[PDB]
DNA sequence: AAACTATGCATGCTCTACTGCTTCTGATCTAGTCGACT
């Protein structure tokens, strides 16, 4: 559960562990010792836990392909990760 | 002629500013360790 929160490792999962948090609860609980990741992948954390689905994928390349054109035109973007491999 | 008073001056003391030199302190750049991620 703890690793499935965006910018908490393994490390600091079982730091959190020895440090008596059992639960989701407690890390919102104290907002204090949480960096800028942890706080954002908190906040959106059953967002982030859905699988992304291929139409996502097409939607998230179509906007990029604008945001790379206005920033130079005839620049290439390329999907590789999980997605290219089907 | 003698006693009292007057001015006059000097030197040490105190303060406030002024300038220049020396030392201390606060702001700004990197190595290492732990951690996050792809």
């Known amino acids: 559960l703890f690793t499935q ?10 730091r959190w562990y020895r440090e008596g948090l059992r639960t989701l609860d407690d890390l919102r ?15 959106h954390h059953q ?3 859905t699988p992304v689905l291929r ?9 990029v392909e604008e945001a790379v054109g206005q920033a130079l035109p005839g620049a290439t973007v390329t999907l590789t990760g999980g997605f290219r491999r089907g």
């Open 29 to 43: 609980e104290q907002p204090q010792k949480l960096t800028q990741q942890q706080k954002a992948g908190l906040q």
């Open 55 to 63: 139409s996502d994928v097409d939607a998230l390349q179509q906007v």
């Open 47 to 49: 967002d982030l836990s």
């Open 5 to 14: 929160i965006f910018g908490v490792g393994v490390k600091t999962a079982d």
